[PDB]
Amino acid sequence: QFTNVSCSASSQCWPVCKKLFGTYRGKCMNSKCRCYS
């Protein structure tokens, strides 16, 4: 879905997404990480 951490690109978000949801399918939107399913 969305996250609560700032991002400096989608790359560094993939691990976030992975930690949060369990997916390595994330993006950086409004300088915040994002995740998918």
Residues in the chain: 37
Residue 24's CB: how many other CB atoms inside 10 A? 14
23-30, Cβ contacts within 8 angstroms, sequence gap of 24 or more: 29/2
DSSP class of residue 21 equals T
Residue 10: give its domain's CATH number. Answer: 3.30.30
Q: Tell me the β-bridge partners of 37.
A: none
Q: Which structural domain, as residue segments, surrounds residue 24? A: 2-35
- Report whether 5 contacts 16 (CB < 8 A): yes
Q: In whole angstroms, what is the distance from residue 29 CA to residue 2 CA?
A: 9
- Asked if residues 37 and 25 have their Cβ atoms less than 8 Å apart, the reply is yes
Report whether 10 contacts 22 (CB < 8 A).
Answer: no
**Number of separate domains in the chain:** 1
